[PDB]
Structures are given as structure tokens and as C-alpha cells.
RNA sequence: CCCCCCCCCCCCCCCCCCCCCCCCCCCCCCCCCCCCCCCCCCCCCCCCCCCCCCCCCCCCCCCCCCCCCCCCCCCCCCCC
């Protein structure tokens, strides 16, 4: 376990990964450090890593398609990763094959970001997901082609402050899944308020 | 056994002049190549300064909400 929360890491983007000798590393916290550039091969050889926290950082550019050199898939080879946190990273786009190898992911956190559109068929490999947290984002539509495999068998859901769109093309499957479910959705009728169109403005 | 004087023709040598043909050097013009310097055309790379745009982090301010601690008051009831 190596905790580096709010330590302002510098020279973190070296060509050889400093966590390469850490073969038995299981918990790694890199939160509140304003890390900007992260290499692709930083977590190579980290088969036994389970807990990864990268919340409150600046990795928005690393996932956009306009980033030179291509998006950074720094989550490859993490077969045993269990809890992942990416809060307040300012993410605006998620690459399609970033979560391709997380076969044992159960807890994922993506709140307080600028997510608006997610690629279709991204959460196929998370067959053992438990909690999905997307509070305080800019998402507007929830559909099967992206959130179908995500909502297979969960236990928690955190999507409070989002401007949901009330349209049969964008929310009908979502509200249908709300009607019958066993996942714990707290304050479902308090902050899951429809922002757009103004006809359904504020309607749960 | 004799010298002299005239003339024709053909020689040889030497000085001058005029012809071709060639060599060397030089002059003028032009062309080609090499080197040096300079000007212009663009397309740029690197560095610095200035100005903005996005995202994020620390600190601070304002408005709150919850919890904890302390103080006061109102009503009800007992002890001596």
C-alpha cells in the first residue's frame, strides 16, 4: 500500500514507471495532486493492484480524441483492480477501450466530472460491478447501448445532480429500469430532477 | 705561240621587299565550370516576451445545511 494523497507529485511521467519494482502493490492513492501527464506503461506489471484512487486531478486532456499521440490507456493489465475513483478529473470524453480488461471491477466512481456523452458498449467487461457513481456531471441521456451491461446486477447508484432529458429516446429505458429494480438508489425523488425540456422542468 | 675588250645563256652566295603556311605570347569580346559575398521569394523549426481560451489544484471570502459543546426561558412533577 502506497498512499500519496495531496502530496503534489512531480516528475510522475518518467519513461520508466517508478511503480515497476512494486510487484506486490495492492493499494495506491494518487489523489489531490493536480497530476497532468500520465504515461501508458505506468501500471504495467501491476497484476496484484486492487485499489486505485485518482480523484481530484487533471487528466481531461489524456482521454480526448484530439490529444496528440492518442488517448492514454493507463488501465491496461489491471486484472485484479476492484475499486477505482476518478472524481473531479474534468473528464469530457471516455475512450472506448479503457475498461476492456477490468474483469473484477466492483466499485467505480466518476462523479464531479464534465461527462456528457459516453461511448456505446464500454461497460461490457464489468460483469461484477456493484456501485456506479456519476453525481454532478453533465450527462443527459441514459440508454441500453452504454448502460445496459452496467445495470446488470448492482447494489448502489449515485447520479444525483445531472440535467436529465425527458424523452422516450433518452430516458424511457432509464425510468423503466427505475420502476423495477433492487439496487439501492437513495433520494431517488429528491434530486433526480428533469432539467430539459422546460415542459418537464423539475419533474422527477 | 699568248693577253685584253664586248655578248648570250646557265649557276652559286649575300642584303632588301612582297607573298602564303604555322608556332609562341598578348589584346578584345563571348561562352562554360568552380569558389566567395549579397539581395529577394516562400514554406518553416527552435527560443523568449506579451495577450487570450479550456481543464484542474491550493488558499481565501460569502451564503448556508448537519452534528457536537455551552447558556437562557416556558410548561409538568417530586424532595426537605
Residue numbers in the entry: 484 to 687
What does the paper behind this entry write?
Toll-like Receptor 3 (TLR3) plays a key role in anti-viral defenses by inducing a potent immune response against double-stranded RNAs (dsRNAs) produced by viral infection. Previous crystallographic studies show that RNA ligand binds to the extracellular domains of TLR3 and induces the formation of a homodimer of TLR326. The charge interaction with the phosphate backbone of the RNA double helix plays the principal role in the interaction. The ligand-binding site involves both the N and C-terminal parts of the TLR3 ectodomain.
To determine whether the transmembrane and intracellular domains are necessary for the linear clustering of TLR3, we produced the ectodomain of TLR3 (ectoTLR3) and determined its structure in complex with poly(I:C) dsRNA. The electron micrographs show that the majority of the ectoTLR3s are in the clustered state. The structure of the ectoTLR3-dsRNA complex is not changed by the deletion mutation and is superimposable with that of the full-length TLR3-dsRNA complex with an r.m.s.d. of 0.42 Å. Interestingly, the C-terminal ends of the TLR3 ectodomains in the cluster point to the same direction even without the transmembrane and intracellular domains. This observation demonstrates that anchoring to the membrane is not necessary to fix the orientations of the transmembrane and intracellular domains in the cluster. Several factors can contribute to the ordered assembly of TLR3 along the dsRNA strands. First, as shown in Fig. 2, the deletion of both the transmembrane and the intracellular domains did not change the structure of the receptor cluster. Close inspection of the region between the TLR3 dimeric units in the cluster shows that the charge interaction plays a role in the clustering. The closest contact area between the dimeric TLR3 units is composed of the negatively charged N-terminal and the positively charged C-terminal residues of the neighboring ectoTLR3 dimers. The distance between these charged areas is more than 6 angstroms and appears too far to be considered a strong interaction.
